[PDB]
Amino acid sequence: TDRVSVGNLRIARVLYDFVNNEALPGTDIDPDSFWAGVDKVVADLTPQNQALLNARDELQAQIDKWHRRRVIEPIDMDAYRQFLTEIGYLLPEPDDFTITTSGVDAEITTTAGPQLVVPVLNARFALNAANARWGSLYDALYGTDVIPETDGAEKGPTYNKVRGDKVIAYARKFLDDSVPLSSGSFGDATGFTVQDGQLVVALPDKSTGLANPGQFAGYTGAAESPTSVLLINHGLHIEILIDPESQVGTTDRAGVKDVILESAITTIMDFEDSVAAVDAADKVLGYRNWLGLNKGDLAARVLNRDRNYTAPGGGQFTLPGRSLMFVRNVGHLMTNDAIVDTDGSEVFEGIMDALFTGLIAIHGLKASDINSRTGSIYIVKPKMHGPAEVAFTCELFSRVEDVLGLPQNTMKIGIMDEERRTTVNLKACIKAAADRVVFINTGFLDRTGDEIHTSMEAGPMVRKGTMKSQPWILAYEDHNVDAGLAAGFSGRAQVGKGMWTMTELMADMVETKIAQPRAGASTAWVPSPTAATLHALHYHQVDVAAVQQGLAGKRRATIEQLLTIPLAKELAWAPDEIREEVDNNCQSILGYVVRWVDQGVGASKVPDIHDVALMEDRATLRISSQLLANWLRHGVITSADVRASLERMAPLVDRQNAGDVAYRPMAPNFDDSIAFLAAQELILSGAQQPNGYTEPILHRRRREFKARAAE
Numbered sequence: 001t002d003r004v005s006v007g008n009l010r011i012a013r014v015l016y017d018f019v020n021n022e023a024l025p026g027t028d029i030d031p032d033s034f035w036a037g038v039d040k041v042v043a044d045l046t047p048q049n050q051a052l053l054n055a056r057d058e059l060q061a062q063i064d065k066w067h068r069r070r071v072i073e074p075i076d077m078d079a080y081r082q083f084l085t086e087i088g089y090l091l092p093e094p095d096d097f098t099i100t101t102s103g104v105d106a107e108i109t110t111t112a113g114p115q116l117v118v119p120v121l122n123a124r125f126a127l128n129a130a131n132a133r134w135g136s137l138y139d140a141l142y143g144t145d146v147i148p149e150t151d152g153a154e155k156g157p158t159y160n161k162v163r164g165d166k167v168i169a170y171a172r173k174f175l176d177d178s179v180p181l182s183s184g185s186f187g188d189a190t191g192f193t194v195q196d197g198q199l200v201v202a203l204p205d206k207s208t209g210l211a212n213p214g215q216f217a218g219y220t221g222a223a224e225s226p227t228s229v230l231l232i233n234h235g236l237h238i239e240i241l242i243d244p245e246s247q248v249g250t251t252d253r254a255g256v257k258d259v260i261l262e263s264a265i266t267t268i269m270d271f272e273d274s275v276a277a278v279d280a281a282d283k284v285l286g287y288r289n290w291l292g293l294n295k296g297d298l299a300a301r302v303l304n305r306d307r308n309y310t311a312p313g314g315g316q317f318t319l320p321g322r323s324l325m326f327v328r329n330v331g332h333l334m335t336n337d338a339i340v341d342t343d344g345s346e347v348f349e350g351i352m353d354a355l356f357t358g359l360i361a362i363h364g365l366k367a368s369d370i371n372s373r374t375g376s377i378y379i380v381k382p383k384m385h386g387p388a389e390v391a392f393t394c395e396l397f398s399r400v401e402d403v404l405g406l407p408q409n410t411m412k413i414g415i416m417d418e419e420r421r422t423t424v425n426l427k428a429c430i431k432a433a434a435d436r437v438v439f440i441n442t443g444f445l446d447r448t449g450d451e452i453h454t455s456m457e458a459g460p461m462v463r464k465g466t467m468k469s470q471p472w473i474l475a476y477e478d479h480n481v482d483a484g485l486a487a488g489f490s491g492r493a494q495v496g497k498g499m500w501t502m503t504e505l506m507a508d509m510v511e512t513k514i515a516q517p518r519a520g521a522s523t524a525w526v527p528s529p530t531a532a533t534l535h536a537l538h539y540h541q542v543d544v545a546a547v548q549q550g551l552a553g554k555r556r557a558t559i560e561q562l563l564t565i566p567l568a569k570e571l572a573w574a575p576d577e578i579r580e581e582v583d584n585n586c587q588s589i590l591g592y593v594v595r596w597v598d599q600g601v602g603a604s605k606v607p608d609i610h611d612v613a614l615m616e617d618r619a620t621l622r623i624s625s626q627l628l629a630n631w632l633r634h635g636v637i638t639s640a641d642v643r644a645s646l647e648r649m650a651p652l653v654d655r656q657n658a659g660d661v662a663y664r665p666m667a668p669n670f671d672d673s674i675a676f677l678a679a680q681e682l683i684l685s686g687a688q689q690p691n692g693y694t695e696p697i698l699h700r701r702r703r704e705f706k707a708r709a710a711e
């Protein structure tokens with residue numbers, strides 16, 4: 001064996017070395033006592049962890065039988081509801097309360113705007129993310145399909161000025177909508193000056209100020225001839241870079257080189273569904289990146305420093321130039337062999353994540369010879385089921401704080417709302433974290449995986465595409481905003497919404513995603529720094545703080561709508577529609593699995609069945625597999641169907657990775673591909689996985705590949 005014995009634990013050496021040599025130095029935490037903390041916290045909390053997982057299995061078991069004992073269709077929702085209360089699945093709502101969480105940064109309590117999520121195992125992507133707090137609107141507009149390439153404005157090897165002018169025009173118009181001049185348009189501006197503390201803008205036959213001078217917030221250079229001008233609207237910053245000597249500024253009517261938008265206000269470094277990390281070596285690669293981010297010395301190429309400005313009244317000030325970080329730890333399910341037992345039992349990965357990522361974050365609270373200036377650590381806990389599992393997270397963070405010698409309530413929690421048992425008890429869930437909570441958040445994929453698994457025995461479900469528009473999910477989206485607002489989230493915590501997955505479809509993002517801030521969402525997920533810039537446009541257009549005031553007190557969702565199961569209408573599909581959906585789901589699984597098992601990639605630009613590039617995480621494996629498994633259970637399709645579909649889609653996936661040197665085809669040797677067998681196992685063993693979770697099968701298969709590669 002290759003482990004370091006500490007109490008009842010056998011720590012993997014790679015881990016042991018990393019914590020001692022890299023992580024602990026600077027934290028003034030005694031390496032001896034730290035490892036004692038670990039062995040003690042693990043031993044003390046592991047049974048509670050295991051009891052929760054057991055309880056998930058008990059409830060599901062009762063719901064399984066219940067559905068199998070229904071003669072009368074359609075489902076009596078009154079009985080169904082009372083059964084859930086009986087078995088303690090549906091708990092009574094607590095009285096109104098207001099969260100009490102202190103020491104939270106302004107990016108979270110106050111500022112509405114984009115929030116970026118990125119695989120922590122990718123230093124470059126993670127580097128770009130932390131620096132994505134500020135980004136160029138011009139590069140984003142020119143680089144993407146927001147500005148059409150319709151004849152004249154196509155992207156070429158060389159810079160296209162027809163295109164550049166439309167980019168300019170777009171930004172000129174954005175200025176008009178966001179920070180309006182009393183008279184005239186930014187489009188005709190010829191210069192910018194600052195006299196007596198007010199911003200004057202040069203116009204052809206006049207000059208004006210802002211309609212609200214308040215929106216002027218600073219500048220750089222000399223007041224007579226500024227190198228930039230800093231505007232604020234809706235708490236978000238806009239910078240107009242003025243440089244008549246630049247290529248763009250030369251042919252610009254006011255000498256403007258660019259417009260810079262405060263984009264990714266916060267960022268989530270992810271240890272969960274966007275990364276593949278199945279052993280001790282994978283975990284330390286992850287932890288090491290998190291360390292470099294927190295010490296501030298990650299480099300491939302560095303982390304930006306803050307920005308300097310002159311106050312409107314000729315003073316001096318500063319704005320942060322990094323995107324405030326969260327970290328997402330893994331949920332309650334998995335164990336990982338980075339630490340094993342004396343009998344060989346793996347130690348729970350969630351517990352490990354709280355200890356290590358929390359240890360590491362201490363560096364981010366002190367001068368990089370920097371992060372939460374108010375003294376907090378931000379962890380996003382995924383895949384929780386119900387308030388009891390939330391209280392368990394508190395106690396974990398409590399103990400870890402003691403081990404690390406941190407003040408209590410230092411380790412804040414963002415509660416993901418992505419499991420059905422959490423949704424319908426959301427108010428209780430927040431109350432259980434009332435003094436630590438900084439964040440709620442909804443999303444399609446995981447929540448829909450759980451929806452389908454929980455009602456597996458009820459009957460055939462609707463196609464994946466139909467789920468977005470089903471009653472349960474609309475109620476869920478609204479119910480989350482309400483429970484957040486009612487618990488006092490406005491001004492105190494983020495209410496968030498899900499990811500835009502179509503990375504090349506930015507015009508479409510720019511028209512569609514605006515509904516999220518309009519839905520009252522203080523923040524929402526974007527897959528890149530570019531998209532974070534474009535999504536920033538939405539918070540300039542929507543006054544989220546006002547939308548939230550207006551929603552306050554409304555109960556827009558009822559428990560009946562939440563509990564409305566997405567059953568399919570009897571004989572709803574034509575045989576070709578069934579085939580299209582099977583082929584679609586098998587392609588989604590195959591497309592994501594092959595990269596996961598063969599290459600340890602947890603998120604990437606995966607072409608779908610129609611060659612649209614989706615940037616999904618592992619949750620897309622849960623929904624897709626649970627759905628085919630559902631359809632299997634109820635005889636919507638056969639096993640001959642599933643196999644035939646997988647065998648057709650694998651060559652297709654193969655070609656979609658034609659440009660990848662490292663790629664191993666799955667065709668034609670299907671049963672010899674670990675990736676192919678994994679895709680197949682997820683589907684055929686799907687009904688039996690706890691809550692449809694894909695980690696057990698996936699992790700095992702990636703570890704199987706690692707071993708064949710070890711030869």
Ligand SMILES: O=C(O)c1cc2sccc2[nH]1
Nearest residue numbers: 117274499603615616617
């Ligand atoms: O589809 C999603 O929910 C998703 C895609 C990516 S990439 C990093 C997180 C994340 N989440």
Ligand SMILES: [Mg+2]
Nearest residue numbers: 273418446619
């Ligand atoms: Mg998820």
Ligand SMILES: [Mg+2]
Nearest residue numbers: 234541542543
């Ligand atoms: Mg407004």
